[PDB]
Every structure is written in structure tokens, then in C-alpha cells.
Paper text:
Defensins are a family of antimicrobial peptides of innate immunity broadly active against bacteria, viruses and toxins. They are small (2–5 kDa), stabilized structurally by three disulfide bonds, form oligomers, and are divided into α, β and θ structural classes. The canonical dimer interface of [name] is formed by the antiparallel extensions of the β2 strands stabilized by the reciprocal main-chain hydrogen bonds contributed by Thr18 and Ile20, and the hydrophobic packing of the side chains of Tyr16, Tyr21, Trp26, Phe28 and the Cys2–Cys30 and Cys4–Cys19 disulfides. Further analysis of probable quaternary structures by the Protein Interfaces, Surfaces and Assemblies (PISA) software indicates that the [name] dimer forms a tetramer or dimer of dimers in a crystal.
[name]/[name]/[name]/[name]-[name] forms a dimer which is very similar to the [name]/[name]-[name] dimer (the average RMSDs between 60 equivalent Cα-atoms of 0.4 Å). Solvent-accessible surface buried due to [name]/[name]/[name]/[name]-[name] and [name]/[name]-[name] dimer formation corresponds to 490 and 495 Å2 per monomer, respectively, indicating that these dimers are energetically indistinguishable. Surprisingly, although [name]/[name]/[name]/[name]-[name] has mutated Ile20 and Leu25 that were previously identified as essential for wild type tetramer formation, analysis of intermolecular contacts within the crystal indicates that [name]/[name]/[name]/[name]-[name] dimers arrange into a tetramer resembling closely the wild-type tetramer architecture. Replacement of Ile20 and Leu25 side chains at the tetramer interface by less ‘bulky’ side chains of Ala allows [name]/[name]/[name]/[name]-[name] dimers to pack more tightly together. The buried interface area for [name]/[name]/[name]/[name]-[name] tetramer formation is 1450 Å2 per dimer as compared to 1140 Å2 buried at the wild type [name] tetramer interface. In addition, the canonical dimer formed by the quadruple mutant displayed a larger interface than wild-type. [name] bound to immobilized [name] with a 20-fold greater response at 8000 nM than [name]/[name]/[name]/[name]-[name] bound to [name], and [name] bound to immobilized gp120 with an 8-fold greater response at 8000 nM than [name]/[name]/[name]/[name]-[name] bound to gp120. All [name] analogs except [name]/[name]/[name]/[name]-[name] bound N36 in a dose-dependent fashion, reflected by increasing fluorescence polarization values with the increase in [name] concentration. However, the inhibitory activity of [name]/[name] and [name]/[name]/[name]/[name] in particular was greatly suppressed with the latter yielding an IC50 95-fold higher than that of wild type [name]. Notably, [name]/[name]/[name]/[name]-[name] barely showed any activity at the maximum tested concentration of 256 µg/mL against S. aureus, whereas its activity remained less than vLD99.9 against E. coli and its vLD99.9 against B. cereus was 11-fold higher than [name].
Numbering used by the authors:
A (entry chain B), B (entry chain D), C (entry chain E), D (entry chain A): 1 to 30
Write the structure that this text describes.
Amino acid sequence: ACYCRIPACIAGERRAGTCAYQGRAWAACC
Amino acid sequence: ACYCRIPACIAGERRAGTCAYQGRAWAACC
Amino acid sequence: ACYCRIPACIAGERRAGTCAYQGRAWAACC
Amino acid sequence: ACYCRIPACIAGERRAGTCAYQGRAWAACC
């Protein structure tokens, strides 16, 4: 599936949404 | 539906999930 | 703050993120 | 960080939040 990162997705991935945990918003990278 | 708040939902509401925007995680209050 | 809707935000609002509750992804409308 | 799954996290992981993408809510597993 998809992995949560900040500040943005890395090479090979593309951003498809967000995650929410530990108080912040993360990019969901798929 | 549901309204995003921090740090928590108010009287009359119940927490049902999360929101993610402006870099942070908010409670979704229903 | 912001209100969760599907399929999209209404006039007067702008989409700023997502909400997650009851199993689905909602627009966070601010 | 954390990986998005449905319906729930697997052994070795803990649920810390949610992900939102492709229209659905996923568990964020850390």
C-alpha cells in the first residue's frame, strides 16, 4: 500500500493522500 | 456530518475520526 | 474551522485536506 | 514511519492513526 512521510513523497512514489497521527498531517505515498 | 477541532470534541459531539489539513491532525467530531 | 463532506466542498468553502472516519475519506472544507 | 493497511495493523505494528486516500480510511500502522 502506502507509506507516510514528511515533507513529501520520495522518488519512485507518488502522493495519493494524507495520514494523521502523532498530531500531524503526513503525505500518503503510494 | 463532522467538524474538525483541536484538541478534542466539545459537549454534544463524539469523536469518530481524524482530519488532516494545514499540517496537523484534528479530531473529527460528530 | 473545517467541515467534512463528500463528494466535494460547497460554494463558499475551499478544500484544504481530508477527514477519515466511518471507513471513508472525506474532503475537509474550510 | 507508518504504513497504511485495512482492516487493521499486523503483528509487530501498533495503530497510531489513519490514512485517507483512494476514497477510504486506512489504519496507520507504526
